[model samples]
Target: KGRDEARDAYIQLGLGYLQRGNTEQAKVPLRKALEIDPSSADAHAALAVVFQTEMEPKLADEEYRKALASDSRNARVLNNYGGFLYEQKRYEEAYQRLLEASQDTLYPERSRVFENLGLVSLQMKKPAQAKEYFEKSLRLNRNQPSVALEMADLLYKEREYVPARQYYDLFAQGGGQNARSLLLGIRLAKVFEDRDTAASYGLQLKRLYPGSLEYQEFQAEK
Candidate 1:
């Protein structure tokens, strides 16, 4: 009982640190959790997330495999592992795995599978298919600002500025946390020759995510 409690505590601590963007701190607790419960797929998956954030893709890949070994039916782990492959540009393998994960209704975050599929489609330059996946994801949960931003990016790439602007506005108004959205919005506004609007969004980005690379680029342009 004590060991179980300790394992749970470590897992919670690990996940908390991860969510707060403290990957370094997350690693210890997650590893400790796995040590206590070697069969804990959740702990292994959490550690995989930390490794992925640290750009240790090989380590992340091993941990993801460990998670799957512990629980083959874990859709979340499968989806994330597939996403890692997608990041590595293994398009065909990633697409197949992610598609399988998307079909798992028992997975709590099924929308994320669709989102990843949309990302892969975008990377493959299948804008229409990407849009379809993004729309499906939105239908599942429209409050996802990142999905909105991705859809905007697809529209922007397709030169559908008006619809792109609409998605960008949705992303901004929905409290999108990334500075890239604002940077892209600024660029789109400039493309449309709406300098005032571009400047306003840039200023807003600087005020919000002040130390971001996007903000630095905005400053450089000034």
Candidate 2:
């Protein structure tokens, strides 16, 4: 029992190819790693990611399952498979898998998992659940500006204008862009009867996103 030298070496090589956006190049080393150790959950997961990146859903699924078969508790496999399932419109299955990943005490990307759960909850039309998950995500990682934007949108839907404005501004400060953000900001400003502020957001929406559906909404409102 000296070292897992070759396995680690192959994984690194395969991952380097993936990082360079060379899925074709990635497969060779990953497959070699798997050939050397068929029970390598990490190799299986990495190869599955290559398939996923290539839009080879069937192959990706097969590899993902193989990874999970080797190690059901692999949070990396669970999270990746959960995202794949979500993209395949298997929301409930994604929910269960991601939930397990999120609750795993040792998972390093807990914040990201919560954010994904929030996204799925939105797709499921569970705004309350989505908002709560988004909050938890942001609480864990203030670097997630997209979560701030999502929080703003959720608050806007609930007509919590004051709080919504705060989040919207937070996202703006973080350099996030959305014509929808501008339109909603304008609308919220109007609701508060703040014409000048509304004009500012409206101006940005019209100037920057003239072709956006949100721009059309802005036109109707103006």
Candidate 3:
């Protein structure tokens, strides 16, 4: 009992460093955790994150496997491993892991799990499924500007301009403005025959992101 308490303390300390974006510092306490208990799944999972952040894919992969072996149903580990697979372009595998993570009803970051599902679904070329997960994600947390923008982009692609504009507006209202969103703004305005609104977005795009491909596309269209 005492040994487990000490190990958990080390894990918490390591997680604190990780939360502060100090990957290098995070390793020390996490490694200490493993010394106290080699089979500590949380410690292994946290080390996996540090390795991932340090771009040591092999180490991260190894740690993820170890973590999973220790606790196969760890939702946090499953979610992180899913992200790692997504980055590796293993969309089907990523989807499988995220699906597992999503089933953890009591997982604190279930919204993020759904968001990852939405992302991997898009990578897998399943737009309808992506939209569904994104909707579920936003339903759980309405403050995700990127998710709103994604909905807007998806709606635009499907010729649902009105709904696209609504989502785009939601994205903007949440203080999310980017080259892609600005370009979408311009296109949405044009579709609505609002030349002045389109011009405003074009101006913002030119000023804020002159070198972006979206800006280049805007210039060619004009």
Candidate 4:
């Protein structure tokens, strides 16, 4: 009973650190959890993320394999591994694995899976397909911030400024603020020659991210 409690505590500790973006701190407790319960795919997957954050590709790959080796049908693990592959620029493999993850009807985060698919599609240079995938993700959950950015960027790139403006508005109204959104605002406003809106976004970017790459571009472009 003590060992079981220890295992659960270690797992929770690891996940807490991970959720807080302290991947280095997450590693020790996750390793302890796995030591206590070697069969815990969740622990192995969490450890894989620690390695991923540290850019230890070999360790991350091994841990992901270990998690999948324990439970091939773990949708969360599959989703993470799929994203790992995408980061490694293995678009085809990432697409296949993410597709499999999304196929798990019992997985509660199907929207995120579709968003992952959308990102992979963009990496594979299939923006139209990515648009379709992102739309599907939005249909599942309209509040995804990353999806809002991607969709707006897509429409903006295609010069469909009207619809793009709608998503940009959605993001701002939802309290979303990032260099991408700010720069997007500036560019979109400039395209329509709406100087007031452009100035508004410029002020925010200047105040919020003075040294950001997007800010640099904003200066260079102007």
Candidate 5:
């Protein structure tokens, strides 16, 4: 129908602007979508993101609730709403919402749901639960370099040096290099007494991240 086509057009336009980080432009077409159909949950959910990005937490929460009122089990809404809750530091509620999102086995972004749950668990100080969720996320999406780095850090803290090095290598191979990871690599190599490897990473850190806190710490340690 022509009405449906117009609504879809508005939704697409809103999403494109949203993805470009132009929340100001994104809200126009998204509001149009809602005008076309007041019960449009996707539009409400998207407006929630726009308001959230614009730092209007109260409006963001209201829009999210409106979206859920229309479709309580919408995985997309739940996933994004869970993120909002996490930002609000409501970790338990964030985990609960993400768990609801994860229950949709057909959700295309199930890996992201698990990743959010992992982060929420960490905020709740449940390292074991965080590890489990992170592993689940990695199992579903091997290309997630951030998750790989997180796993490496967690393993390192647990004193599981062998697997820690493995995950760190995986992160590096995935183009996840940064001052933090480089510093972690240096420490890991030192733990194993691989002086050459440690020196190599240390050299890279000093060269690439000379002004970084990690580099300053490296110099202090030396």
Candidate 6:
């Protein structure tokens, strides 16, 4: 009973650290959780997220597999493992696992799997299919700025600037106030001869995230 309580406490602490984006702090608690319960798949999955964020992909892969080994039905583990595989460009396997994981309503952030599916489809050069998945993700959460960004990027790449601009404007309006987004909107406005709007975006980017590389580039352009 004492060991079980310790394991639960450690898992909670690890999850707290993960939510705060403190992967370094997360490692200790997750490790302690696993020490208390060697077969804890959730602990292994949590550790895998920390390793993945730290760019230790191989370690993350190992932990992900361990998680699945301990509990094959664990949707969170499968989704995250699929994400790792997607990053590694194992698209077919990633798609399969992500699709399966998305079917599990118990998994939090299910929309993220759809986003990954869109990315994989895009990578495979199936833009129409990619758009479908992206739209599904957006339907699940209209405020998904990253999905809006991807859709904009895809439309831009296709030289469909009007639709792309629409998506980009949505992305920006939805609190996607990153320097890169600002720069893109600025450049697009300039291309469309909206000098006043372009200048405003440029100035806004300079004021916010002044130290960003995109901001530096914008300054250099002037």
Candidate with maximal lDDT: 3
**What lDDT does candidate 6 reach at residue 147?**
91
TM-scores for every predicted model:
0.73, 0.90, 0.94, 0.85, 0.93, 0.77
Q: Least accurate stretch of 10 residues (summed lDDT) in model 3? A: 169-178
**Per-residue lDDT for 1-222 in model 1, tens only?**
999899989999999999999989998998899789998888999999999999998899889888888877678888999899998998887888888788788677888889999999978888799899999888888888888898888888889999998888888788645688778888888888998978898888989989899999888773
Candidate 4 positional error at 88, Å: 2.2
Q: Candidate 3 residues 86-191, lDDT tens each?
A: 9988889889989999989899888989999999999879999999999999999998889999999999999999999998888989885889889998999989
Error of 5 at 46 (Å): 1.1
lDDT by residue (tens digit), candidate 5, 1-222: 888788888988998998998889998899899999898888898889999999999999999999999989999899999999999998888988899999998888899999999999999998888999999999998888899888999999999999998988888888657899888988898888989978998899999999999999888764
Q: lDDT for every model?
A: 0.87, 0.87, 0.92, 0.89, 0.91, 0.85
lDDT of 4 by residue, 1-222 (tens): 898899889988998998898889998998899888997788888889889999998999989989999988788899999999999998898898888898787788888889999999998889999999999999999998778889989999999998998887776777778887889989988888999989988889989999899999988865
- Candidate with better lDDT, 3 vs 4: 3
TM-score of 2: 0.90
Q: Report the error of model 3 at residue 7, Å.
A: 1.4
How does residue 50 of candidate 1 score in lDDT? Answer: 92
Question: Which residue pairs of candidate 4 clash?
Answer: none
Error of 2 at 103 (Å): 2.2
Candidate no. 6 TM-score: 0.77
**Over the full model, what C-alpha lDDT does candidate 5 score relative to the true structure?**
0.91
Worst 10-residue lDDT window, candidate 2: 1-10
Candidate 2 vs candidate 6: the lDDT winner is 2
- Candidate 1 lDDT (Cα, 0 to 1): 0.87
**Could you tell me the lDDT of residue 163 within candidate 2?**
91
Query: Which of candidates 2 and 3 is the stronger one according to TM-score?
Result: 3
TM-score comparison, 1 vs 2, better candidate? 2
Q: Which 10 consecutive positions of candidate 5 have the poorest summed lDDT? A: 168-177
